[PDB]
Amino acid sequence: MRLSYEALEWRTPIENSTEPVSLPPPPPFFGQERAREALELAIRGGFHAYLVGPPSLGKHEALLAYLSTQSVETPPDLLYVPLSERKVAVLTLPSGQEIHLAEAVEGLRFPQARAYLEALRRYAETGEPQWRPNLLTSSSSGTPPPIVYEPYATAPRLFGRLDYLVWSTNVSLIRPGAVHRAQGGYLILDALSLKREGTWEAFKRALRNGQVEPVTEPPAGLEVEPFPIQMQVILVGTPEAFEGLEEDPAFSELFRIRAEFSPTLPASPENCTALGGWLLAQGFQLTQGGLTRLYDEARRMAEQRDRMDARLVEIRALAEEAAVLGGGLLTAESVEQAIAAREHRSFLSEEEFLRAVQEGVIRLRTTGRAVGEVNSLVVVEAAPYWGRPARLTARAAPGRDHLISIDREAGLGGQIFHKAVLTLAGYLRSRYIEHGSLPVTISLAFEQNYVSIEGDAAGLAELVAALSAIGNLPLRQDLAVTGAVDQTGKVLAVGAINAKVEGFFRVCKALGLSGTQGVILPEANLANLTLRAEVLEAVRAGQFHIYAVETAEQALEILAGARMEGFRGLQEKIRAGLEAFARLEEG
């Protein structure tokens, strides 16, 4: 099927582009119901939790805002009291009550502070010439609760520190750490910091056994008693940051509540609207057209017409660059030009590539017809992931049912690439059985490929090239091909479909558009096509064409300009090539 411009258009119409947007701020965790409900359960139960999702989602900011609105009983006074001259314990009194027990002490009613005083009893008995309590923290309301985010999870920052007054130390030189500041509230840490700082094991001991030991230096130290920890801990990281941790059975025992962010949201008016109020709350001066373009770029970032990228921080960053190009104002134009300027800043590699193609240094065809050749499409695996055409050839000779991937044999192709070649072999052997095993040897090459290549998305290009070489069928060179194939010859979805289409358009444009150029791709990728304006306009102009197919043979038909049947069709030509190859091989 031909995809009309109307079928391809995906962008949101803009009405009144320059009108200022006025919208209220959405709540924390909008569109992230799963994670919000997980966290509510952790708050309700007192459970420790972990927040998981890809980078730049705004997980930390959403979490601090959600915690900001909570309420808890005012946290107790928190202090170190000596039980000895080499021993200390961590103690809570009801809030404020510290300053009174301190002044009573500062002399020379507190049922909780028993052991401190008992043990505070023989300077008189021996003239025996370091003793007053050490307030770590206090506060006036548990609303908001204590919220301590410590991004740098070293032992001293987690657990506090012993200072040394020349060498001596005592109860009053013990400084608190994040764990101490987070009591009666929330401690937030990054999974990655716990790993990198080597503090995961000591952090477990703190939570499993109440062992919280201030950091010392390798003279003579104070013993610090364990203490019942009163805090909720929330770890933050990516799916991958957590896999180190999840191989420790203790991780699951301690961190029961998974709060997982989706990398995308539904592309809905409600989510557009929420995006708008969020941007306004961040301080942007936003116009309707500016909101619309940012929303649609989020859909394009997701490569899904019906979903949008949920990475609020990436959206904000693009908006910040747009705001500069609009002189402080976030407009449709400013966003389109921020996007263009990102591509320009990263375009050197493609400009070198296109120049090499124009010069004939890389040999590519974008017009005419040839047997056993086709433009497939690849993506370069360095950000921002440009797509390019790659010339592929297939050559057929009389022989013993061999399909040879030259790139794979030379060590350039990977396991999935290899798998796609094997799959085609399975299709071809079983599809053409009249001569027993296939009387051809077929060799496939990515002609100017010098790098490792991986994936199954050249399967369609390979199979059509192969059928073309078997049948001596000239194929159009103005249509590039992308698609995976299964053993039955159906065409399957591929990735990076926008970059691929746009990459072939870019080469066609640099070599001069013929008016008949285009791309054959999987029907299964229709919902991923969120093509840039320039390709859409070319397709609207009849200057570029997109075909969607379900089977390999459908692709061959388009490329060879005939049907498989209605014989004089392709199938009889294919069968005739195979008979010719079998006569050369046998007789």
Binding site: V378, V379, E381, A382, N449, I453, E454, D456, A457, A458
Partner: peptide, 5 residues
């Protein structure tokens, strides 16, 4: 850089 199809 390596390439994906």
């Amino acid at each position: 850089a390596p390439e994906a199809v």
